Design a binder for this molecule. Structure first.
Ligand SMILES: Nc1nc(O)c2nc(CNc3ccc(C(=O)O)cc3)cnc2n1
Ligand SMILES: Nc1nc(O)c2nc(CNc3ccc(C(=O)O)cc3)cnc2n1
Lengths: 265, 265
């Protein structure tokens, strides 16, 4: 079905073989440093190793805050993790400068929650290093004429920005942006119609992990959202998504893997 | 979508509102009794209450063994559970006599793994008490021309038997019989094509809980099959099934409920 692989420097991600698990690296900062202190950098590295041993295929790392301050926090983490853990790293930022530094520091994928719309220059950054960029759907309002049609329209605007800066088709990944700019009921409606995103011709990443719309449905707090997260991941894989972005790697890998076998992926 | 409710004597099961959870009552016998001893009957009752507090909507109770011996074991359990727990009970047997006794003892649904083919008289039993009967797909071989087409053909044979004894359409429920008469890969193939069962026009029950085909996929023992069971339940609900038969009620209820909200059930 996909006639190429995802090229991330030293690592290759095949898109046909299995659903790919992006593990959400947790980044508890030391209150006393802005730096890359020993307690935080080590907490991260250990967490990255845990997710790798659990079945993660990508480690996702994220840093109101300034550019220089986000870079200070995130660069030492990318460095330590890239050296100590053999999986591609995505940098979860919407800032062209953060993205540059992270890639230089060892990051392999750009993960942009504003889909190149907050800082269009990020698409230039991706275009130059030749890395995959994830363009997530987002906007500053909840006023939809037709949720799905608008989401596709908005994502198409991100693609135009990425392509106009030289981003190759093969390094575009899309994300419906569950939990952003959507009421709970709109979140459920995007889940239900997720397969429509496939007409755009790009691999899709789904991130639903522990989000409040699950809490809204099940009336359960964040630490109780594992079953409802797995429901989303499953329906996500059934509707053709290539990656999921999850906190509970062990559990979701097992679900993904069972889904794949059933759907014939 | 369904223009009737499932009538089980004192209880009504709506089929449009949510996916219905059938909890699998566990029945550890006392080595010293054949009877309805205090340790076993009480272990059952407590388990039934637990599943009810977890979200089960039906309690499923099951007893090489003789008719009189299966009745001795199962009747005291139905009696104690029906009195102490306010949910309909299904009796998991393929024997017309067991089925009679159980219904008399308080059981509301017949659950037949041979789909009225082992003891056709069971369909007479259901026809008389006017109860729902679950006709599960089964056979004594694995020689399929076309797995799905044959499954539908075989289930249709059960329907003919049930209907010919007077069973009303509204008390027919079908079950694809995952884990019976199918290799692992055939199990996965029925999961993948489960929606085909809907053309027969009956509510479908899916039972996959902890079965070996999950172990085959994930290489995990029975007590490690929760994530892979949830995958099946989810794909099952996405493909239109009305009931699932599960051991882990708490976890699967949450998954079901999240699925329902997403699919719009
Ligand atoms: N590519 C990608 N895809 C996502 O889905 C994503 N989500 C978040 C996290 N954002 C949220 C949003 C809403 C909620 C809530 O309502 O609870 C929680 C977390 C961060 N980076 C992300 N990156
Ligand atoms: N209606 C209904 N639907 C079922 O699916 C079902 N399954 C069993 C349990 N049978 C099995 C079969 C196979 C396996 C394995 O391979 O591990 C385990 C248990 C018992 N009653 C059942 N009743």
């Amino acid at each position: 079905k996909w006639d190429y692989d995802l090229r991330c420097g030293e690592y290759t991600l095949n898109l046909n073989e299995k659903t790919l698990i992006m593990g959400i690296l947790n980044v508890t900062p030391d209150s006393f440093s802005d730096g890359g202190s020993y307690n935080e950098v080590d907490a991260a590295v250990r967490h990255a190793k845990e997710m790798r041993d659990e079945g993660a295929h990508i480690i996702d790392i994220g840093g109101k805050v300034s550019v220089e301050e986000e870079i200070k926090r995130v660069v030492p983490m990318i460095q330590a993790v890239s050296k100590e853990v053999k999986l591609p790293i995505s940098i979860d930022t919407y800032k062209a400068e953060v993205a540059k530094q992270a890639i230089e520091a060892g990051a392999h994928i750009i993960n942009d929650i504003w889909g190149a719309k907050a800082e269009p220059k990020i698409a230039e950054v991706a275009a130059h290093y030749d890395v995959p960029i994830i363009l997530m759907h987002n906007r500053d309002n909840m006023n939809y004429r037709n949720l799905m049609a608008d989401m596709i329209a908005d994502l198409y605007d991100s693609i135009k920005i990425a392509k106009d800066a030289g981003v190759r088709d093969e390094n575009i990944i899309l994300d419906p942006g569950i939990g952003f700019a959507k009421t709970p009921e709109q979140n459920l409606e995007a889940m239900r119609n997720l397969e429509q995103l496939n007409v755009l011709g790009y691999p899709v990443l789904l991130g639903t992990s522990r989000k409040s719309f699950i809490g809204h449905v099940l009336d359960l707090p964040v630490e109780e959202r594992l079953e409802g997260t797995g429901a989303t991941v499953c329906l996500g894989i059934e509707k053709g998504c290539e990656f999921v972005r999850v906190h509970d790697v062990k559990e979701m890998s097992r679900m993904a893997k069972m889904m794949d076998a059933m759907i014939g992926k």
